[PDB]
Amino acid sequence: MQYDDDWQYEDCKLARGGPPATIVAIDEESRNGTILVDNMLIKGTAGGPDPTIELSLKDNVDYWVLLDPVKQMLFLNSTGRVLDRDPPMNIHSIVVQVQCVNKKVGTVIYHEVRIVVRDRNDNSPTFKHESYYATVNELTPVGTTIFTGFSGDNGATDIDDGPNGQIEYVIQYNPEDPTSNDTFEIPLMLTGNVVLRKRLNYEDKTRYYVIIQANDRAQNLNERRTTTTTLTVDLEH
């Protein structure tokens, strides 16, 4: 006879095995109405004309989450805004509780939902300045580093996380100054420091327009983003 009534306590318990927290990942900047959890799998029926449970959200900071109690589904609520993982918003995860009240015995169980927000490559490299400049003496030896102006966030930065936000620098051929990519080199693409590759001649040529492109390091080559600047190099006598 003891524990004959334990069926009364079943509603509000998980209708699945596995760990108590429900953990999902969703892309940053997902559209309003995006499904966060397809089915909470909680035993019992919320809503309808004869519910055995009541379901509601607790600790729903900034109301990112919306609950449909009948389907036990959780959705993103982002109308008039965006779920942004990047600075300045910095939303890396959303944690909410699905409170379940068992109507028959009045017990309350909290089912935690942890939503990990994944970074998208939605930002391009941005240069701090619109253009860059270097002055080099004509007698500068070949192999000398002549520009280091991308050091310490003075060059291109990228607000995404991981390789999405890491930059590589490369010199491109300049059809309006064809010898510039032959006279200068960026041998270490991660720094974008520029080194002299050919001997200079002030009596021949006094200015170079070096086209430098910064790209991020997204895993998918077709999702990489690029930005271009010009380094103007002037000789001094």
Binding site: Y9, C12, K13, L14, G17, P19, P20, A21, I23, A25, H92, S93, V95, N102, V105, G106, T107, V108, I109, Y110, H111, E112, R114, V116, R118, D119, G162, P163, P187, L188, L190
Partner: protein
């Protein structure tokens, strides 16, 4: 001459999270770091930073990650750890979000003990006379408390969800002057429920 190209991690958990159950035994492998190097350089792996070096260790030649001390979801539900990989010419690092998985590993703790109450012998049947409370920090069913008397009393009942104690049968001082009842607070974990006992003294007056 080819300049050195630094290694890069390939694990997909860096793009999301790595879930590790709090009941994972110390010494257990939790994952294996994977990396590539365009020079085909042999790679050496490590853990980097304070909180990482605390909980994890890394086999340097294989990248196997293992638990150096226990996790505890009740203390820390998630944290960020930085791993390193090196081709002996440069070291690169990358951070991963660790989500700590819950299991039922606490019993409930009672509030406001000791429990004692004096009631007159003519307290009517149905009268609520006391409220017991206990909390439990585990997630979900493992954190939801049920109260009972062990064994049940023919003179008092306790509401299983609310902890309210009521008189259910007429009292008689000359027969019984005091009751020492055991209250059980249990969580509702399916596989490993945990519980705690408290005494409740009910003193009957004149």
């Amino acid at each position: 001459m080819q300049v050195n190209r630094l290694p890069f991690f390939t694990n997909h958990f860096f793009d999301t999270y790595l879930l590790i159950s709090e009941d994972t035994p110390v010494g257990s492998s939790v994952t294996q770091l994977l990396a590539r190097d365009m020079d085909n350089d042999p790679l050496v792996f490590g853990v980097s930073g304070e909180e990482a070096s605390r909980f994890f260790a890394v086999e340097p030649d294989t990248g196997v990650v293992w638990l150096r001390q226990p996790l505890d979801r009740e203390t820390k539900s998630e944290f960020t750890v930085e791993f390193s990989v090196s081709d002996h010419q440069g070291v690169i690092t990358r951070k991963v979000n660790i989500q700590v998985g819950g299991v039922n590993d606490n019993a409930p703790t009672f509030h406001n003990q000791p429990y004692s109450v004096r009631i007159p012998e003519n307290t009517p049947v149905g009268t609520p006379i006391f409220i017991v409370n206990a909390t439990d920090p585990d997630l979900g069913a493992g954190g939801s408390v049920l109260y009972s008397f062990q064994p049940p009393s023919p003179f008092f009942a306790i509401d299983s969800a609310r902890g309210i104690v009521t008189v259910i049968q007429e009292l008689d001082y000359e027969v019984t002057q005091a009751y020492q009842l055991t209250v059980n607070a249990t969580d509702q974990d399916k596989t490993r429920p945990l519980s705690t006992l408290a005494n409740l003294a009910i003193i009957i007056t004149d």
